[PDB]
Paper text:
The studied chitin utilization locus (ChiUL) is encoded by the soil saprophyte Flavobacterium johnsoniae, which is a Bacteroidetes member exhibiting gliding motility. The ChiUL of F. johnsoniae consists of eleven genes that encode four enzymes, a predicted inner membrane transporter, a predicted two-component sensor/regulator system (TCS), and two individual SusC/D-like pairs (CusC/D, chitin utilization system). The SusC/D-like pairs are believed to be specific for their cognate carbohydrate targets, and act in concert to bind (SusD) and transport (SusC) oligosaccharides across the outer membrane. The resulting ChiOs, and likely chitin crystals as well (analogous to the archetypal starch-binding SusD protein of B. thetaiotaomicron), are captured by the CusD proteins.
Author numbering:
A (entry chain B), B (entry chain A): 45 to 526
The structure:
Amino acid sequence: NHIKGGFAPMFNNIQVLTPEWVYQLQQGLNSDIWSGYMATPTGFESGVNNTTYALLDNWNGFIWDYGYKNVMFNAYDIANKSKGKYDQFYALSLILKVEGMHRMTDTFGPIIYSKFGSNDATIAYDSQEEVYTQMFAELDTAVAELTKRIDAGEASTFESTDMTGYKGKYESWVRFANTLRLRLAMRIVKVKPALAKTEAEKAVAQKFGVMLVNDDSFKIVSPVYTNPIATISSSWLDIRMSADMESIMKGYQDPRIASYFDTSKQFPNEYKGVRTGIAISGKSDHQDFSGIGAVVRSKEIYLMNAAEAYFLRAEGALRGWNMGGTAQELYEAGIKASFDQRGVSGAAGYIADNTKTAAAYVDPNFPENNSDPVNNVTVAWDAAATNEVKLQKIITQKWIAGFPEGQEAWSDYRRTGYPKLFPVLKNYSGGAITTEFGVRRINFVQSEKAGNSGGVATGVSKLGGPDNGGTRVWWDVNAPNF
Amino acid sequence: NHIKGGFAPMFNNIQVLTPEWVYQLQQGLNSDIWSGYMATPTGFESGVNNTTYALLDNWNGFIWDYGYKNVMFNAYDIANKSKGKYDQFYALSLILKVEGMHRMTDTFGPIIYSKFGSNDATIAYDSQEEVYTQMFAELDTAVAELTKRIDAGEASTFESTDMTGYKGKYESWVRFANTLRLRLAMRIVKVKPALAKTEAEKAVAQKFGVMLVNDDSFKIVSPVYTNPIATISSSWLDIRMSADMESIMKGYQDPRIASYFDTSKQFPNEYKGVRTGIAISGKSDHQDFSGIGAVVRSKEIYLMNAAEAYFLRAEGALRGWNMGGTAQELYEAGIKASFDQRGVSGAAGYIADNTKTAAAYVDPNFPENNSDPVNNVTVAWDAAATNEVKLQKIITQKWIAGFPEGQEAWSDYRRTGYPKLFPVLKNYSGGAITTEFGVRRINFVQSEKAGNSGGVATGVSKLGGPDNGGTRVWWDVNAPNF
């Protein structure tokens, strides 16, 4: 009973479910926009903000503070109480820890990890390379422990505490952990392709393997909280469909558009997105473009869909790895999984179409925001296509399937450059962040500079360059995809 | 006859031998100082300059302009005249091309390579990753061609054109090419350890192997010019012994100090170095510190010593690669090779010393420039030391042996962080360049922004971040040494 209470704040703060204004700062005004998923019609701080590459420390500190207070602390506390005593809870805490904390390192680079809880005046940061090794080892520990208990036929003691689709089922938690390993493996393929291959193949070959059906998906099922985006969109009109989403989903005439977005008030019965990184004269100019749709009007918040497992395996197969299918088979299975998850028909026709491509983008009353399409690729698999075009197809479909979870899409975009996104028109970074490559990370936070200046200095050392949004984290090496 | 004339400008402009003021800008006021080899007593441009991390476009453009006009153009011209007709000359041009142009990409990152000589308005840059692949392939072509001729007993037709220690001997040119391959292979060990291993092992496996004795060293033997550093130092007093060299070489009581540097005029019979990245009141405050010594009072300019081949193999052995010998054997052999090269005795005692370490640095009349030692490692091999300490020993000895060739030392320092160097006290980069990590590259040059703006845009794209001195080139990944 003293252990079980630590899980709720972990579940409730991977994405901060309440209050909504905290989610808006934790993710809504960073990766949800940089990923190309969503855009704001509001000219916050005179239009000089995260969306125009002037990173705002007053906004971005919330990411660190809520994650450490609610995810990391409880991982630490649960481990202290359970490791070597109630190892099933320790194992489950490790899986949740990695789910929450990989997002943290993917945002900042170096982070506090091994030294968390230290009483030293300096709480040192680990390098991102070190954190990734630790996370893979933590998943090793968790998977071995739970698999042992499953093999023994041990009844779960986690159902009453679980807040996911899994209802305490250890096998489902292991399958999630395997899929999370596969995500982390693919993340590092440019910097450590040998480790990427090892960890990816381990994930797929583990007894219970990775996600195969939609019931395998990782989601938070809250008894009381709606996805915060519902309020930020429908109530506040502070976030809308993006121009990238309009270009790509209208181009493909994608039936998932109906659940992802609402038709526009300003343009009745039409799906209209807002361009990011623009000049904004008044909020009313874009607030009546398309809102975020029914997928966020729910107490269930998806954090990793089964579709992603297929697209990860498809990329692994493209790279020649032992993924259990061909790149084409896995690509097409991923698309079908997503169509099924969204409850829409026509997957077969969509999959076979080798004509439809991204559409031109028009901002009707502000043509300065217009663009020719940039993600110029069809859905249909072409065996004769280059590896880059094959990867572009896979990541495009992965990006569509993963909406509205902007953090993973931002990480995948940084790594692969896909899908192609419209560049910002206004860049107020003073040269620190490029228009072509956009935001590569967020700089170390105010609470840390205030209370842990010695730690921040270790973080800067392990970052290897200026502490701004243009400096690449360890896995985001300036290197080609193959 | 029409082909041979192209070689002289290549030989004479890897380091620009004349005029001396051009060498000062090409290398003397960048890597010769950033490497920790040398320091200026002169407060050029009010002390806001390359040495205080305000990169000066009017200085640094010389690197690109002289390299492309004299090395690259002649490689291109010779290839056009000789490829498929006189392949011995083509092969030799490729080796010289890689010797000159690897320095170029190591300085800027993306460079013009495959598209050189294009008539298009945009002459596109290649990525550094692409350039490295091409250089390895060029060395493959050169090595195969010359080895074929050697195997056939074909007499050299290059002696009258050669301006090195090799006197036209193809076998010595192949041995140099192998050693250059090994250098380039180790450079990329953090970004592409698989390719690093492949290319390093190829270098050693080739039938002539890498440099073994000092006569194998690559040097320019000028019939007319003295090393331009002799003038810059002795005549102009614009460059002096550095504080890092004083700390390290005095700490070890290294007998090579006597030929590397002259005793100070201000401090009779003492070796005194100047701190880099400082405030300078007047040139006279430091101009009478130690000058650069007898090693530059020569018409022979060393560009790759046999000692480096041993230290490359030593590091390869640390990594478990097929290098011939143990890390300890190769380390000690490299030190002996360097002592022999410089004509000094006492190698055995120096090699066995496990006490002497870097000395504290004092600027007698300006104590604000003082520092405790930072390269705190002894010479003696310790089998029980960590891989990092072993590497620190190897690179420290490599750094001493390679004086006064600052470019390779700067590249090795960027890759490994060794030897430890004194940080600058003044940093006028406006945040673009960190004090901790120093200059990682030079920004694209004025002549290119003026006459090839389309090409520069491709270079910036292939750089992956802001075009300034803090952005890391492809091989300079933020990753650990092992």
